[PDB]
Symmetry: C9
Subunit: 30 residues, 9 copies
Amino acid sequence: GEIAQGLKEIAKGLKEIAWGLKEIAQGLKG
Amino acid sequence: GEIAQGLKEIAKGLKEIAWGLKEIAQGLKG
Amino acid sequence: GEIAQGLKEIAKGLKEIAWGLKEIAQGLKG
Amino acid sequence: GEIAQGLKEIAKGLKEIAWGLKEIAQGLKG
Amino acid sequence: GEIAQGLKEIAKGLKEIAWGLKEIAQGLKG
Amino acid sequence: GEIAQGLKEIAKGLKEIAWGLKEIAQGLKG
Amino acid sequence: GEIAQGLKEIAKGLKEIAWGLKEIAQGLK
Amino acid sequence: GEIAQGLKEIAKGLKEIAWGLKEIAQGLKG
Amino acid sequence: GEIAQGLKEIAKGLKEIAWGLKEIAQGLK
């Protein structure tokens, strides 16, 4: 369903945010 | 559907936030 | 529809947050 | 409609958060 | 309506968060 | 109603987050 | 109700996040 | 119910975020 | 159900964010 798909896309967005935080961590580390 | 589309736009907003975090990481790195 | 429009406005809010993060990145860079 | 209005108020809250982030950026910049 | 009111209270919470960010900005500025 | 009450509790949680941010601001200021 | 309970658990999670922020504030201070 | 369970899992995710913040606090403290 | 599954995926996303914060903590100290 399309609503379920929208929720799954939101989840993917949150995972992208997590990756961004990991990049910040690498930036702090050096 | 329009509600599903709204959820998909929210997901895109989250992806933009992720990109902002990546830019912050680059800003720390230099 | 008005509920869908509300979701779309939320998405726009998230994009504004992303722009704020990009400004923070620029602030760190200089 | 009142639920739609609630969503629109949430969006306005997100925009205020974005402005807060922009103020942080200005604080970093000088 | 009570659900709408709940959403409006959430919006107010987000505005309080925005104010907290503005206070952080002032703290960075001096 | 109980769903409305749940939303109101979420709003209170957001207000607590705002207070946390205010404490961070005070920590930066001194 | 169980949906209401789910929302209340989310609220508790937000309060835990708030406490984490307060701990960060103490760490800065 | 499965929707309720999804909300409860989201709550657990937020608690994990809180633990991450506590780890950041420890990182600042040392 | 698929909506419930979507919520569960959101929860997993939040857990990934938590791990990112832990990585930031390690980066700080």
